Structures are given as C-alpha cells and as structure tokens.
Amino acid sequence: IIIWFLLLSVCLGSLIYSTAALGVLMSNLGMPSYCTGYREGYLNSTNVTIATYCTGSIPCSVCLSGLDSLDTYPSLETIQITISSFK
Amino acid sequence: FPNTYLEGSVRVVTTFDSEYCRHGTCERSEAGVCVSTSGRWVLNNDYYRS
Amino acid sequence: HVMSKHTDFSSEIIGYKAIDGGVTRDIASTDTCFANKHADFDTWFSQRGGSYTNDKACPLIAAVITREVGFVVPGLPGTILRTTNGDFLHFLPRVFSAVGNICYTPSKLIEYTDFATSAC
Numbered sequence: 001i002i003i004w005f006l007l008l009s010v011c012l013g014s015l016i017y018s019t020a021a022l023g024v025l026m027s028n029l030g031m032p033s034y035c036t037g038y039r040e041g042y043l044n045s046t047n048v049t050i051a052t053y054c055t056g057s058i059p060c061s062v063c064l065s066g067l068d069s070l071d072t073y074p075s076l077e078t079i080q081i082t083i084s085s086f087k
Numbered sequence: 088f089p090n091t092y093l094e095g096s097v098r099v100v101t102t103f104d105s106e107y108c109r110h111g112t113c114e115r116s117e118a119g120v121c122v123s124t125s126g127r128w129v130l131n132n133d134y135y136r137s
Numbered sequence: 138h139v140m141s142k143h144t145d146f147s148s149e150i151i152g153y154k155a156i157d158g159g160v161t162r163d164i165a166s167t168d169t170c171f172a173n174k175h176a177d178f179d180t181w182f183s184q185r186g187g188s189y190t191n192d193k194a195c196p197l198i199a200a201v202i203t204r205e206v207g208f209v210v211p212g213l214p215g216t217i218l219r220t221t222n223g224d225f226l227h228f229l230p231r232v233f234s235a236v237g238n239i240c241y242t243p244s245k246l247i248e249y250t251d252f253a254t255s256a257c
Binding site (some may be wrong): 043046048066067068069070072073074075076077078 | 140158159160193194195197210225
C-alpha cells in the first residue's frame with residue numbers, strides 16, 4: 001500500500017530531475033526547451049523573489065534554479081532582539 | 088515609539104509604564120520625562136540615566 | 138550561484154557604503170569580509186591599503202550614485218537594480234550632495250553616524 005505511494009513519489013522526483021537536466025542542457029546549449037518560458041518571464045519581471053513569481057509551484061522553481069535572487073542574501077535579515085531588563 | 092515635543096540637536100520625550108520597541112531592539116522603560124543634549128536615543132531607565 | 142563583477146554606471150558613483158544587518162553603516166579598513174558586485178570597489182579599497190575575502194555571509198557593498206537608478210522595494214534601503222545577466226545591484230540615490238546614510242523617523246528624516254546611538 002505505502003510502497004506504491006513511495007514508488008509514485010520516486011517516479012515523480014525522477015521526472016522532476018529529468019526536467020532539471022533538460023534545463024541544464026538548455027542553459028549549456030541554447031536552447032528552445034521546456035524551461036524557456038519561466039526564465040524568460042522572470043527575467044523581464046519586477047519580482048525580486050521567486051516565491052511570488054512561481055507561487056510555490058515545484059516545476060517553476062526547478063526551472064529557475066541557478067539564477068540570482070534577492071532571497072540569497074542572509075545579511076538583509078534582522079533578528080528582533082530584546083535588550084537587558086534591569087540590575 | 089514614545090511621544091516627543093522637540094526634535095533636533097536637543098530632544099525632550101515622555102514615557103509610560105510600557106515597553107517600547109524600535110527596529111531590531113525592544114526596551115523596557117518607566118513613565119516619566121527625559122531631556123537630552125544630543126539627538127541620541129533616550130528612554131527612562133537606570134542605563135540611560137547613568 | 139556565484140557572484141560576478143559589473144562596471145555599469147561607474148561614472149555616476151561618488152563612493153561606496155556597507156549594509157550590515159539590514160541597516161546601512163560606514164566602512165572601516167579593519168573589516169575583513171564583504172559581499173561585492175562591483176570591480177571598481179577593488180580599486181576603491183586597495184588605495185586605502187585594505188584587503189578582503191568575498192563571501193555571502195558578510196555585509197553587502199552599495200555604491201552612492203548621483204543618478205536615479207532602479208526602483209524602490211519596501212523593506213529594503215536604497216534602490217534595487219537587476220543586471221542584464223540576472224544579478225541584482227544596490228545603490229544609494231540622493232537629492233543633495235551633503236548626504237551620508239539617512240534613516241527614517243516617523244515624522245522627519247535625520248542623518249546618523251551609528252544606528253545604535255541615533256533617533257533612527
């Protein structure tokens with residue numbers, strides 16, 4: 001029962017990896033391919049973050065792997081800190 | 088942020104019995120009035136009083 | 138992804154500023170690591186005798202520019218511009234020459250030298 005679902009998840013992951021490999025081959029040799037639309041739309045878009053552009057969709061994020069984004073900067077964060085209370 | 092009545096080189100502030108917080112730093116202060124000769128951040132406590 | 142160096146808008150830059158913890162601050166020669174996207178910053182820092190190592194876990198370098206470049210994103214200081222290669226850039230626009238790093242009070246804008254000891 002659970003084994004069938006695990007195998008389905010493995011096959012879906014393998015298909016996603018195949019699409020990622022196709023995107024890598026595109027970035028290396030061109031290329032008119034599956035991942036052209038997402039990257040072409042994202043390059044001209046004003047969305048500095050991939051979360052708002054892809055809306056959390058897995059294939060869109062997979063096609064966009066390897067490109068610079070605002071989310072890659074950890075120094076822009078600011079952890080809220082409570083100062084010492086008293087003596 | 089607390090209420091203020093003068094801004095610039097010299098500042099006067101008023102506080103209540105509640106904690107105030109700013110960008111990345113929250114602090115606890117008591118009610119009162121403080122006067123500073125410089126535009127530095129001011130709150131009513133022993134640390135700033137010293 | 139590996140950061141790259143770009144030289145666009147080099148003639149419009151007066152100086153450089155560092156962003157640490159989401160707040161812009163002045164640069165000192167004692168600092169040892171930065172995140173950089175510009176090549177002229179190497180000449181800017183070498184003339185003062187400084188050396189550094191590039192890493193993503195270090196304060197970003199931003200250039201003070203006299204030209205309105207990029208667009209404003211809420212929560213981020215200055216302006217953000219994206220290069221033709223996809224890399225992003227940061228700049229500090231100004232209206233008047235006597236501008237260092239400016240922070241926002243709820244009512245007015247006041248310059249500061251240190252965020253921890255200012256009305257910011």
